[PDB]
C-alpha cells in the first residue's frame, strides 16, 4: 500500500451563525450557554411592538373583508332563494354572484397579508435553525440589532461527524491520477480510507473516508483541497485544529523491498547493493532506493525479481571474492 502524509484542519459537520431577521432592542436571552439546543427552540426575544401593531392592522383589515364577504353571501343566498320561480331577473342574480366572488377574493388577499404579518411577528422570537451545541452570546440584553446584520449573535454547530480539509499538491494529484490510469496502481471498492494523526501523535482509533476531491487550484500555493469525513463519538476532535492525514492511494503489486542493512550509500546519495551471482561470487549493482518504508527501502529500478542480495557480513566480503550463500529469513 502507498501512503501519503498531508496537513489539514478540521471543521464542523453543520454550523449555523444565528442572525436576526428583524431590527429592535433585545429584551431577554432564553438559552443557557454551552448546552445542547433542540431545533426550533426560541433563543432571543426582540422588541415586538411595531410588529404587534402591524399584526393588529392586518387583523382589522381581515375583519373588514370578512364582514363584506358575509353580507355579500347573505344577499346571494336570498337572491338564489327568490330566483326559483323567476321572481327576480337573472341579471341581478349574476351580479350578486360576482359580488360574492369578488368579496371572497378580497378575503383571500387579506388572509395572505395576515399570514405575512404573522411570519414577520414570529421572526422576532429568534429560533435556532438547526440542532447541536451552542456557544457564547456575542450580544447581551439591551444590544440593538438590525435585519441581516453581519455580526452574528451565536453559533450552533454539530460535532458528530467531523470534516477534515487536507491540502494536496496539484502535481502530486496529477501524477497519482496518471499512475492510476496506467494500471501501475490499483483501486479497491469506493472511497479511499484516511487515517489521522493529532498533535501529540496518537493514532485515531476510528477511521474516516475521503470524499469529494476538489478541482480548483489555489493560485498562491498551487495546491487543491480534499475533504475527509471522520466519526467523532467521544468528542476527541474539535473544529479548527491542526491535524495530519494519512491517505492510501492504491496498492502497488510489483513493489520490491530491500533490507536497509544490505544497501550502501555514497556520501553524494547514490546507492549500491552487494549481489551474489550463480557463480557464488559477489558483485556491486547500483540501485535507486528513493523511499524508505518501515525499516526497508523501496527499490524502483536496477533490480529484478529473483536477485540474490546479501544483507549480513558485508565487512567480511570484498567484491570479486568467492562466497557461499546462506538464506536467512
Amino acid at each position: 500500500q502507498i501512503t501519503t502524509e498531508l496537513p489539514g484542519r478540521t471543521s464542523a459537520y453543520r454550523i449555523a451563525e444565528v442572525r436576526p431577521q428583524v431590527s429592535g432592542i433585545i429584551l431577554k436571552r432564553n438559552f443557557k450557554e454551552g448546552s445542547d439546543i433542540e431545533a426550533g427552540v426560541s433563543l432571543y426575544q426582540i422588541d415586538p411592538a411595531t410588529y404587534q401593531a402591524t399584526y393588529d392592522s392586518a387583523k382589522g383589515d381581515l375583519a373588514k373583508a370578512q364582514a363584506a364577504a358575509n353580507i355579500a353571501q347573505l344577499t346571494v343566498n336570498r337572491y338564489q332563494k327568490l330566483l326559483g320561480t323567476q321572481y327576480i331577473s337573472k341579471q341581478e342574480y349574476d351580479q350578486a354572484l360576482a359580488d360574492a366572488q369578488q368579496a371572497n377574493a378580497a378575503v383571500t388577499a387579506a388572509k395572505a397579508a395576515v399570514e405575512t404579518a404573522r411570519i414577520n411577528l414570529a421572526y422576532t422570537k429568534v429560533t435556532s435553525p438547526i440542532s447541536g451545541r451552542i456557544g457564547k452570546s456575542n450580544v447581551t440584553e439591551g444590544a440593538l440589532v438590525q435585519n441581516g446584520q453581519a455580526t452574528a449573535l451565536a453559533t450552533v454547530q454539530q460535532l458528530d461527524p467531523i470534516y477534515v480539509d487536507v491540502t494536496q499538491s496539484s502535481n502530486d494529484f496529477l501524477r497519482l491520477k496518471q499512475e492510476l490510469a496506467n494500471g501501475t496502481l490499483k483501486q479497491e471498492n469506493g472511497k479511499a480510507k484516511v487515517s489521522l494523526i493529532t498533535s501529540d501523535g496518537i493514532k485515531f482509533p476510528q477511521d474516516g473516508t475521503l470524499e469529494f476531491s476538489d478541482v480548483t487550484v489555489d493560485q498562491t500555493t498551487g495546491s487543491i483541497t480534499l475533504r475527509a469525513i471522520f466519526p467523532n463519538p467521544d468528542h476527541t476532535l474539535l473544529p479548527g485544529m491542526f491535524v495530519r492525514a494519512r491517505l492510501e492511494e492504491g496498492l502497488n503489486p510489483n513493489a520490491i523491498l530491500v533490507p536497509q542493512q544490505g544497501v550502501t550509500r555514497t556520501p553524494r546519495g547514490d546507492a549500491t547493493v552487494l549481489v551474489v551471482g550463480a557463480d557464488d561470487k559477489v558483485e556491486t549493482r547500483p540501485i535507486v532506493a528513493s523511499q524508505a518504508i518501515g525499516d526497508k527501502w523501496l527499490v524502483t529500478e536496477g533490480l529484478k525479481a529473483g536477485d540474490r542480495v546479501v544483507i549480513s557480513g558485508l565487512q567480511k566480503v570484498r567484491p570479486g571474492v568467492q562466497v557461499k550463500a546462506q538464506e536467512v529469513t
Partner: protein
C-alpha cells in the same frame, strides 16, 4: 518558503534542486585522463627531508 493558514505550503525542494557539489567549478584536474585531486606537502624548517 510560504505557508498559508489552511495548511497549504511550499517547500524548497518544490522550487529548486538541492545537491552536494563544489565551491567553484573553475578548475578541472585530470591525471592521465582520469579525474583527480592533489595535495602539496612543504618541508617544515629544521626537518629531515628523507
Amino acid at each position: 518558503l510560504k505557508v498559508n493558514q489552511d495548511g497549504s505550503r511550499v517547500l524548497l525542494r518544490d522550487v529548486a534542486k538541492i545537491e552536494l557539489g563544489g565551491e567553484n567549478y573553475d578548475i578541472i584536474a585530470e591525471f592521465n585522463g582520469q579525474p583527480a585531486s592533489g595535495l602539496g606537502i612543504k618541508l617544515a624548517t629544521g626537518a629531515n627531508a628523507l
